[PDB]
Design an enzyme around this catalytic site. Sequence first.
Site, mmCIF file in Angstrom:
data_model
loop_
_atom_site.group_PDB
_atom_site.id
_atom_site.type_symbol
_atom_site.label_atom_id
_atom_site.label_comp_id
_atom_site.label_asym_id
_atom_site.label_seq_id
_atom_site.Cartn_x
_atom_site.Cartn_y
_atom_site.Cartn_z
ATOM 1 C CG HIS B 9 35.736 44.130 37.979
ATOM 2 N ND1 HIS B 9 35.459 43.531 36.775
ATOM 3 C CD2 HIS B 9 36.006 43.128 38.843
ATOM 4 C CE1 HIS B 9 35.552 42.225 36.898
ATOM 5 N NE2 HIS B 9 35.889 41.944 38.157
ATOM 6 C CG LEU B 70 33.013 49.172 47.570
ATOM 7 C CD1 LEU B 70 31.694 48.444 47.835
ATOM 8 C CD2 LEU B 70 32.979 50.556 48.181
ATOM 9 C CB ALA B 71 37.201 45.098 49.624
ATOM 10 N N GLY B 73 41.200 42.782 46.712
ATOM 11 C CA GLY B 73 40.983 41.406 46.297
ATOM 12 C C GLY B 73 42.063 40.973 45.318
ATOM 13 C CB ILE B 74 42.144 38.199 42.864
ATOM 14 C CG1 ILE B 74 41.792 37.116 43.895
ATOM 15 C CG2 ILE B 74 43.175 37.688 41.878
ATOM 16 C CD1 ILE B 74 40.345 37.067 44.330
ATOM 17 C CG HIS B 75 39.879 41.615 40.092
ATOM 18 N ND1 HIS B 75 40.298 40.825 39.026
ATOM 19 C CD2 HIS B 75 38.658 41.150 40.449
ATOM 20 C CE1 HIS B 75 39.379 39.918 38.754
ATOM 21 N NE2 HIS B 75 38.342 40.117 39.596
HETATM 22 C C1 LIG Z 1 38.247 36.680 41.446
HETATM 23 C C2 LIG Z 1 36.760 36.661 41.103
HETATM 24 C C3 LIG Z 1 36.034 35.603 41.948
HETATM 25 C C4 LIG Z 1 34.595 35.506 41.471
HETATM 26 O O1 LIG Z 1 33.802 36.398 41.827
HETATM 27 O O2 LIG Z 1 34.256 34.581 40.708
HETATM 28 C C5 LIG Z 1 36.053 38.001 41.250
HETATM 29 C C6 LIG Z 1 36.141 38.776 42.317
HETATM 30 C C7 LIG Z 1 35.491 40.082 42.551
HETATM 31 N N1 LIG Z 1 34.748 40.713 41.628
HETATM 32 C C8 LIG Z 1 34.372 41.842 42.264
HETATM 33 C C9 LIG Z 1 33.551 42.868 41.637
HETATM 34 C C10 LIG Z 1 32.769 42.740 40.421
HETATM 35 N N2 LIG Z 1 32.742 41.563 39.757
HETATM 36 C C11 LIG Z 1 31.922 41.876 38.729
HETATM 37 C C12 LIG Z 1 31.620 40.846 37.742
HETATM 38 C C13 LIG Z 1 32.353 39.769 37.515
HETATM 39 N N3 LIG Z 1 33.448 39.339 38.129
HETATM 40 C C14 LIG Z 1 33.676 38.083 37.721
HETATM 41 C C15 LIG Z 1 34.487 37.184 38.267
HETATM 42 C C16 LIG Z 1 35.395 37.389 39.377
HETATM 43 N N4 LIG Z 1 35.297 38.320 40.210
HETATM 44 C C17 LIG Z 1 36.497 36.408 39.632
HETATM 45 C C18 LIG Z 1 37.684 36.676 38.719
HETATM 46 C C19 LIG Z 1 38.042 35.449 37.914
HETATM 47 C C20 LIG Z 1 39.247 35.899 37.139
HETATM 48 O O3 LIG Z 1 39.277 37.019 36.554
HETATM 49 O O4 LIG Z 1 40.196 35.109 37.151
HETATM 50 C C21 LIG Z 1 32.823 37.644 36.558
HETATM 51 C C22 LIG Z 1 33.653 37.428 35.300
HETATM 52 C C23 LIG Z 1 32.100 36.340 36.901
HETATM 53 C C24 LIG Z 1 31.061 36.536 37.986
HETATM 54 O O5 LIG Z 1 31.235 37.354 38.947
HETATM 55 O O6 LIG Z 1 30.045 35.814 37.885
HETATM 56 C C25 LIG Z 1 31.875 38.824 36.466
HETATM 57 C C26 LIG Z 1 31.811 39.481 35.097
HETATM 58 C C27 LIG Z 1 30.373 39.593 34.609
HETATM 59 C C28 LIG Z 1 29.711 38.231 34.538
HETATM 60 O O7 LIG Z 1 29.729 37.434 35.507
HETATM 61 O O8 LIG Z 1 29.136 37.966 33.462
HETATM 62 C C29 LIG Z 1 31.375 43.263 38.676
HETATM 63 C C30 LIG Z 1 30.441 43.898 37.662
HETATM 64 C C31 LIG Z 1 29.188 43.059 37.460
HETATM 65 O O9 LIG Z 1 28.752 42.421 38.453
HETATM 66 O O10 LIG Z 1 28.637 43.020 36.322
HETATM 67 C C32 LIG Z 1 31.971 43.866 39.869
HETATM 68 C C33 LIG Z 1 31.812 45.276 40.378
HETATM 69 C C34 LIG Z 1 31.888 45.304 41.902
HETATM 70 C C35 LIG Z 1 31.557 46.688 42.409
HETATM 71 O O11 LIG Z 1 31.050 47.469 41.561
HETATM 72 O O12 LIG Z 1 31.787 46.991 43.622
HETATM 73 C C36 LIG Z 1 34.873 42.043 43.640
HETATM 74 C C37 LIG Z 1 34.622 43.192 44.574
HETATM 75 C C38 LIG Z 1 34.671 44.508 43.801
HETATM 76 C C39 LIG Z 1 34.704 45.660 44.776
HETATM 77 O O13 LIG Z 1 35.129 45.398 45.929
HETATM 78 O O14 LIG Z 1 34.320 46.809 44.410
HETATM 79 C C40 LIG Z 1 35.651 40.813 43.844
HETATM 80 C C41 LIG Z 1 36.440 40.383 45.067
HETATM 81 C C42 LIG Z 1 37.822 39.917 44.633
HETATM 82 O O15 LIG Z 1 38.278 40.304 43.523
HETATM 83 O O16 LIG Z 1 38.455 39.143 45.391
HETATM 84 NI NI NI Z 2 36.617 40.069 38.502
#
Ligand SMILES: C[C@@]1(CC(=O)O)c2cc3[nH]c(cc4nc(cc5[nH]c(cc(n2)[C@H]1CCC(=O)O)[C@@](C)(CC(=O)O)[C@@H]5CCC(=O)O)C(CC(=O)O)=C4CCC(=O)O)c(CCC(=O)O)c3CC(=O)O
Ligand code: NI
Lengths: 119, 119
Positions: B9, B70-71, B73-75
């Site tokens: 990520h 782990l799972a 998702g969109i990513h």
């Molecule tokens: C689609 C979305 C929906 C949403 O969450 O809003 C989404 C989805 C998911 N994220 C996942 C993982 C992590 N996400 C982070 C961090 C962030 N992710 C963010 C946004 C989004 N993440 C949206 C995308 C919007 C777009 O890009 O268009 C940020 C920007 C905003 C925020 O999360 O607040 C924030 C950046 C830091 C910040 O917020 O400043 C970290 C690291 C960390 O936490 O620092 C991990 C490690 C996880 C791990 O290590 O396992 C997983 C499961 C991962 C897994 O399964 O491993 C899903 C599930 C899925 O993708 O469907």
């Molecule tokens: Ni994300």
Amino acid sequence: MEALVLVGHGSRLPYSKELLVKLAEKVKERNLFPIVEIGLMEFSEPTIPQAVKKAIEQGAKRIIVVPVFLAHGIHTTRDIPRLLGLIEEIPEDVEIIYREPIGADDRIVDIIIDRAFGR
Amino acid sequence: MEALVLVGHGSRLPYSKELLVKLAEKVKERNLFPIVEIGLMEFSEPTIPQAVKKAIEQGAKRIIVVPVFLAHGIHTTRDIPRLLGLIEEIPEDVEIIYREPIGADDRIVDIIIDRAFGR
Ligand SMILES: C[C@@]1(CC(=O)O)c2cc3[nH]c(cc4nc(cc5[nH]c(cc(n2)[C@H]1CCC(=O)O)[C@@](C)(CC(=O)O)[C@@H]5CCC(=O)O)C(CC(=O)O)=C4CCC(=O)O)c(CCC(=O)O)c3CC(=O)O
Ligand code: NI
Ligand code: NI
């Protein structure tokens, strides 16, 4: 007396929650803990506070919360500790024990290697 | 001839990238692949396309991309396959092989159980 709460991110897709749920099922199958509950941070139910309450209501005094996340991030260092009120509720005589994420564990490199090979 | 690209990520914190890096190190230590590279989706370098190019430049014709997530998702279902141009810079005679995430693997339940016990 002790409860395990698995905690996940949550997704708008369902895959994430399925994962948590299968994980819970599997640990249930090992008969180690009296109570085993899941909570998602965002999007889905149960929520983390819901899962924690559900655990207390079944009579747990020590709540083991494991973040099912690969790495530390803002979710694991701010949001979740906050939600369990370890930073900013719960019966005075109950302690939440906030565990560590998965990290760079050897078993993960095993898993990754298998995944490379389509196994 | 074949390269392994671990894909993560990315976070604004460094922990995530450290994890990828330690993972790469460990698989390097097992001597199974000629080339082993990492890429983060967002926030960090190397980026996914950077890691893929770096792999080709070392002479890899078959690029194994494993999503260290782990799972699904969109990513893992949109952004990454897009970035590897599997749905919409790759030589026509190179194939990207997009692998599966970690999922609800037994070894994860082993890891989770250890984490519950502060081990
Ligand atoms: C689609 C979305 C929906 C949403 O969450 O809003 C989404 C989805 C998911 N994220 C996942 C993982 C992590 N996400 C982070 C961090 C962030 N992710 C963010 C946004 C989004 N993440 C949206 C995308 C919007 C777009 O890009 O268009 C940020 C920007 C905003 C925020 O999360 O607040 C924030 C950046 C830091 C910040 O917020 O400043 C970290 C690291 C960390 O936490 O620092 C991990 C490690 C996880 C791990 O290590 O396992 C997983 C499961 C991962 C897994 O399964 O491993 C899903 C599930 C899925 O993708 O469907
Ligand atoms: Ni994300
Ligand atoms: Ni998030």
